[PDB]
Design a protein around this ligand. Sequence first.
Ligand SMILES: Nc1ncnc2c1ncn2[C@@H]1O[C@H](COP(=O)(O)OP(=O)(O)O)[C@@H](O)[C@H]1O
Ligand SMILES: Nc1ncnc2c1ncn2[C@@H]1O[C@H](COP(=O)(O)OP(=O)(O)O)[C@@H](O)[C@H]1O
Ligand SMILES: Nc1ncnc2c1ncn2[C@@H]1O[C@H](COP(=O)(O)OP(=O)(O)O)[C@@H](O)[C@H]1O
Ligand SMILES: Nc1ncnc2c1ncn2[C@@H]1O[C@H](COP(=O)(O)OP(=O)(O)O)[C@@H](O)[C@H]1O
Ligand SMILES: *CC(=O)Nc1ccc2ccc3cccc4ccc1c2c34
Ligand SMILES: *CC(=O)Nc1ccc2ccc3cccc4ccc1c2c34
Ligand SMILES: *CC(=O)Nc1ccc2ccc3cccc4ccc1c2c34
Ligand SMILES: *CC(=O)Nc1ccc2ccc3cccc4ccc1c2c34
Ligand SMILES: [Mg+2]
Ligand SMILES: [Mg+2]
Ligand SMILES: [Mg+2]
Ligand SMILES: [Mg+2]
Lengths: 372, 372, 372, 372
Amino acid sequence: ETTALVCDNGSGLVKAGFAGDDAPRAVFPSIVGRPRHQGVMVGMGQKDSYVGDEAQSKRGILTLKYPIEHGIITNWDDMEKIWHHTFYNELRVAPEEHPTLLTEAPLNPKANREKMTQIMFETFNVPAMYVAIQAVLSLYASGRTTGIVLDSGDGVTHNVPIYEGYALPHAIMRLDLAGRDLTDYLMKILTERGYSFVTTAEREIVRDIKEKLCYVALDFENEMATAASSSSLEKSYELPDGQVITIGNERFRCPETLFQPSFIGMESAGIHETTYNSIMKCDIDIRKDLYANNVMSGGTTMYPGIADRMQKEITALAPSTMKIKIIAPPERKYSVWIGGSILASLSTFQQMWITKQEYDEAGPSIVHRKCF
Amino acid sequence: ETTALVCDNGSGLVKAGFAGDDAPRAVFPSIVGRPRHQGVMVGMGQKDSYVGDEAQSKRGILTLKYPIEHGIITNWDDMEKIWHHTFYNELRVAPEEHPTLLTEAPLNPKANREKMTQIMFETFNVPAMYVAIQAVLSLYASGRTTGIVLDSGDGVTHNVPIYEGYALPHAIMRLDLAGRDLTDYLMKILTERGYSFVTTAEREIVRDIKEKLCYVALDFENEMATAASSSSLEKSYELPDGQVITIGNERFRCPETLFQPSFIGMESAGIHETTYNSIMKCDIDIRKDLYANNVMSGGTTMYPGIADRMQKEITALAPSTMKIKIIAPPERKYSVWIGGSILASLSTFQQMWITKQEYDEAGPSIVHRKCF
Amino acid sequence: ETTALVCDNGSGLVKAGFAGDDAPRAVFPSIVGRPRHQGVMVGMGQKDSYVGDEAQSKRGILTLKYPIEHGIITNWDDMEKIWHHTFYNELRVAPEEHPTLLTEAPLNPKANREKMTQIMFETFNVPAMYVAIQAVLSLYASGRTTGIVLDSGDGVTHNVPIYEGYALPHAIMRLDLAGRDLTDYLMKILTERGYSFVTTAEREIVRDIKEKLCYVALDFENEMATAASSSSLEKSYELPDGQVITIGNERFRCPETLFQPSFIGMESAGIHETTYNSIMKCDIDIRKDLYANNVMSGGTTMYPGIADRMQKEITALAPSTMKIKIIAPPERKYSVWIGGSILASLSTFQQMWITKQEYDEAGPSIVHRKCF
Amino acid sequence: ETTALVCDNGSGLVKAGFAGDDAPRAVFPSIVGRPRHQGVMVGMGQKDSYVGDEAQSKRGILTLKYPIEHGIITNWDDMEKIWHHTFYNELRVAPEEHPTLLTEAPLNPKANREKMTQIMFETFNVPAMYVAIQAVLSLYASGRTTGIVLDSGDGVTHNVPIYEGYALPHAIMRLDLAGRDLTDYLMKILTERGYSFVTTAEREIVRDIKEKLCYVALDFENEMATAASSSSLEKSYELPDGQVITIGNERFRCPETLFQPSFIGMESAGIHETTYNSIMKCDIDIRKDLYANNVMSGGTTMYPGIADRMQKEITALAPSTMKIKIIAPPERKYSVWIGGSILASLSTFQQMWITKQEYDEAGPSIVHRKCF
Ligand SMILES: Nc1ncnc2c1ncn2[C@@H]1O[C@H](COP(=O)(O)OP(=O)(O)O)[C@@H](O)[C@H]1O
Ligand SMILES: Nc1ncnc2c1ncn2[C@@H]1O[C@H](COP(=O)(O)OP(=O)(O)O)[C@@H](O)[C@H]1O
Ligand SMILES: Nc1ncnc2c1ncn2[C@@H]1O[C@H](COP(=O)(O)OP(=O)(O)O)[C@@H](O)[C@H]1O
Ligand SMILES: Nc1ncnc2c1ncn2[C@@H]1O[C@H](COP(=O)(O)OP(=O)(O)O)[C@@H](O)[C@H]1O
Ligand SMILES: *CC(=O)Nc1ccc2ccc3cccc4ccc1c2c34
Ligand SMILES: *CC(=O)Nc1ccc2ccc3cccc4ccc1c2c34
Ligand SMILES: *CC(=O)Nc1ccc2ccc3cccc4ccc1c2c34
Ligand SMILES: *CC(=O)Nc1ccc2ccc3cccc4ccc1c2c34
Ligand SMILES: [Mg+2]
Ligand SMILES: [Mg+2]
Ligand SMILES: [Mg+2]
Ligand SMILES: [Mg+2]
């Protein structure tokens, strides 16, 4: 065998490529868009649906919907369209020769992984596959075997702690607040500036505002008083129609939802308390190495200043006689994929695949007695 | 103090009166009309602008514009003219003795409420004021403290779920489709009968057609097939020039835009799905009392048969093991004003006003830390 | 200043007088006649030209020509002779002390009004002047501010719709068919009785036949069949030489040209259809008040039975569910002058004059940016 | 099948020809004239009605009337005479062998398209037909699939936004101001020079003045001040009798009605604001390509300098950080016909005709469910 496919199906983006590579060769959004309007010039390249980058380019006339919602595939008819887009148009490979490596979040429903396995063998006919946990791959991309991982993507935020290669599944804290809910809260608090974003095509306009104008304030209540003298905390954004918008305290107030989830109305804890509660559910001896290895991942942890407040606010919870080290790599948008590329190229992993002859004798129940 | 003023500045009409009354003493449209013509006979009572009922009578020579558009006051020079018409010519009171009660929609821009507060203290010099929420007052007029309120007026449609007096601001679904957009869609689909209504003076002719010839079909595709045998579903209307028109399927097809917003080209859900999506964003425990208390309000919910389809189509979305009760009072055109009259007469409310000495030291930012 | 002059320069007659008077003190025809014969007895008061009533008396030896043709002054050398006759011989006043009020028709050429202004300042030296519209003054004489005005004099027929003192200049219809063309058609259809009227002195003989023998038939095709038994519809007229003439169907057939302009070969509508087309070019809201106020004026509308057919035939065009009221005052030969006498005696009009110091700084272009 | 007929029934002209040709083989006005006079020499080829070019030659003795008025066929007895003139005298083909392609304006009455379909199958008996939209065919003639189309012809001005072959029918702005109303306004403002054009035979004399003496001023108020020194902005025209007329500011003041519709008394926006309001009703993502593709069409957009002011005045409304490209082809009088010739010659279109066996089973309601 030459290579192996590593397909990280996130809620927002699809990262895909080959094992051994240090960067995915296919990054495109998880969008399947149907045209909503009439259509008069029938022909000249009008498809029934648009997937990925072509749905992002033609997004004005399309109803964009994402098949993966909070890490759970709810649109299996359209998730097959993204995989059909992935292997045949973004990578130009046939899946019959390459073993694929899929990922998913922990504490996921069992019907999600059983149908990822069923489609990869019956539709695409892979030689073998494997479904890994995203937070465990992200720790392995950083060259560690010990550390609690804050993987926060577009659909889910989870907090898997790992000590010396042993997962502690009773301490995994799955939170369904991620970059999608911070986008939907930014759409809510831009209406108080008279900025109406309503359709799902302006959902990516507000998402692009969030990716280049939002930051995490070190102290939120002192930053709100600074924004009362609204001069220095205001930046302008260029809308695609040529309009400009001026946002002030809305820059730092939507990443505050990661730390105060009561803004979108969730009876829940912040990402700093669910990190602290996940350490305090582990054993007393291994906490010394978990406060020292706080690896962040995903795209939601790419805010300017999120690692500074993450250290500043766990230290307010942890006992002061020990150190807190937040690990923020610069490549952590792709660290779940990078850990998948190292894993699929290991020689000690080559006997841990789920082959075709193991699937048809035991059905879909083979995929649950393999992980953890 | 004897009485207080309750001014409901809707997008279409202005309701105004006194606290304790059961009906407003001043109902007139939110119209400021300028003359568009020459004016040869200079004098004999030709004013520069006509406001309210006098602009509705002289509407054939006036360009009618509304200062409130989708619940947002965009014409602050002309909104003061309606308030100058309201307190001085419709109520004949001086605002220096009476505390006023204004209303607005939720998820409104912050500059809208600040300039309502600034004009009511600097121009009219009220003793105290308070800006309430329209859907919360409509529930309080119905004698309830629990229920989701579909307040669809002339400018905006919005759902506010309230449970035991606690508002859930993360579940408020604001939708800018309302009775104005159903008037502009009825103007669009009367052109297929050869009926040309173009200027803003025929905008109230088409609006008057809508208020007495339109109904909500219980099943739309069966009603369109019934209207193919176009005999029983046609009624005639008397235009002011003596002409008669005959409208058929256009009677029930413009209130269908409330339930299918794709007719006017909005990627949005109907009023039945934004009600269902607003209940499903509330907590699982309180949904039992929200499906049972569906209070409707505003003038747009006054169609014949709108409560019957609202119950028929939430039931298709809600689980069948529980009951749906759409509450449609017969006085629900004024229910936002009625709840404002009960609120301004409460003795437990008299300490919740925003007085003049609270405004001049704290500026316009006092009015945002008072509501919700 | 005590008084002000009101000079209505019609095509047929000159009405002149003072403001405040209820009747003009000078009514004489717009005639300047030159002698066409030898004149052997040189002297004894033989003037070079005869103006007004003295030309109507000596008309047998004169070539009578009218300087105002279809409301347009084409003979400015001879229009000054009528004005010189008017101020100095019919009113016996000097124009240097009295501000004059001139009138003209709508949709008139700009060189007509600029030369009325130039002659009234550079020849007669009035203190101030104003050129008004004839049909707007006729509505103001009737005490109305709303109504479409069928003004039909000797030179032109024109409709002006006015609503609440606001003229609608896009809906002004102007029709050059008037009482002069009905005189020239009566001269044509008297030749089939062998009555030869050829020169311009018999033009006033036929005009005097028309003013006391012509009537408007209620139904024309039934009246033509009634005149087959040519006994009851014939009346005799006394020519100035002593001859008698007997006219039958020619009594009602020339006022039919007002309603059927194809008799004199004009591709045009009647006065009932140009009234209806001028209402239907107005806005649809004000049509209810325009069908109910049909003020007629001029001398051409003095036919017996013109108001009965005007109501009978607009009703055939207007929708039947509304009323048509033709307003035919008995003084409507002078209603253009009467409205000018009320206007020049107002106090709100005294600042709307065109004074001498406004004319010499802006030239003749001052007179267009004040009226319409 | 050899060819297909493309008959563009405009309000002013009839363009007809064959599919594949680059120019129509039949251009003649939509005029049916009846003789209004006696006709003493009975015989020698005096027909009862004259259609098209033969009515334009004999127009002095005819009452010319238009069956198509504001894009609505109101004279179905006389519209069949133009089609009978078209296939049998201008093209010399029998319609039983050729499938025809008709056009009409958007937001047209339903009875207009049904009677086009009924007459083409019952009277002329075509094999198949299709009724298209005029503005969509004009964009397709320019080789584009994306752009907003200002198709201003003789009866109607309408904007249609099209993005990549998907029409947005909620953003179509239809305006009933076109070249006929600019002709009727020019007849009105030539009367202030003393030029009396009244009958319908001088309606084409004034129309021929407009087609070769009228231009669009870049700035209107500076051009009116330039015309005060009335030397350089005056040109002469040769009337058919031999008279010459000198027009000054009336050259550029009637195409100003396209940009200021208040001159003819319409509460409406100009063609630059209805273009801008139609873009601002589209989605934010597609506006970048609609401001860059402003395709104009029709004969009314053939004024010298209309594309320069169209770019100058949308730029005053659009945000300044983007480009506005008005597309003005030199062949845009026939671009609605050219796009119909390309469409009827396609092979992907040959299954979209409305055949005879589809019409007789479903009646005239087939023609509405095969558009947009
Ligand atoms: N550079 C950035 N800065 C801030 N936020 C970002 C950035 N890039 C992505 N995001 C947010 O993170 C989410 C993308 O995370 P992603 O890496 O796609 O996770 P997944 O692939 O698991 O969905 C998006 O919703 C986006 O809003
Ligand atoms: N009796 C009625 N039946 C149906 N629709 C109505 C009726 N009265 C008003 N409407 C519609 O509702 C709107 C008025 O709602 P209104 O109570 O004035 O709300 P708001 O005061 O918040 O503007 C108008 O646009 C009108 O078209
Ligand atoms: N009493 C009358 N009956 C019928 N026709 C009349 C009468 N008086 C005048 N006319 C006609 O009307 C015309 C005079 O109209 P007039 O009032 O002089 O208008 P103007 O002053 O604008 O010329 C004359 O041509 C005459 O033929
Ligand atoms: N060369 C021209 N320059 C200016 N205006 C023109 C020209 N040709 C035609 N027009 C005006 O455009 C109108 C004709 O438009 P046309 O292309 O016939 O549209 P349609 O075929 O849809 O009626 C006429 O009313 C005429 O006044
Ligand atoms: C289901 C699962 O957790 N798989 C998984 C994830 C990550 C990871 C990293 C490094 C590894 C080294 C050797 C073997 C395995 C096996 C499974 C595995 C990993 C590794
Ligand atoms: C801003 C706001 O929502 N005000 C508001 C609305 C409605 C309402 C109803 C009943 C109440 C009883 C007691 C106190 C208050 C206070 C505010 C208020 C209400 C009431
Ligand atoms: C040019 C013009 O139309 N002047 C005009 C005509 C008639 C009329 C009647 C009554 C008026 C009352 C007040 C002011 C004016 C001013 C001009 C005027 C009139 C009046
Ligand atoms: C009803 C209608 O809009 N038909 C229409 C108009 C224009 C147009 C242009 C180009 C096309 C290409 C392929 C197919 C079709 C089909 C219908 C059609 C068009 C086209
Ligand atoms: Mg991820
Ligand atoms: Mg309201
Ligand atoms: Mg007169
Ligand atoms: Mg055309």
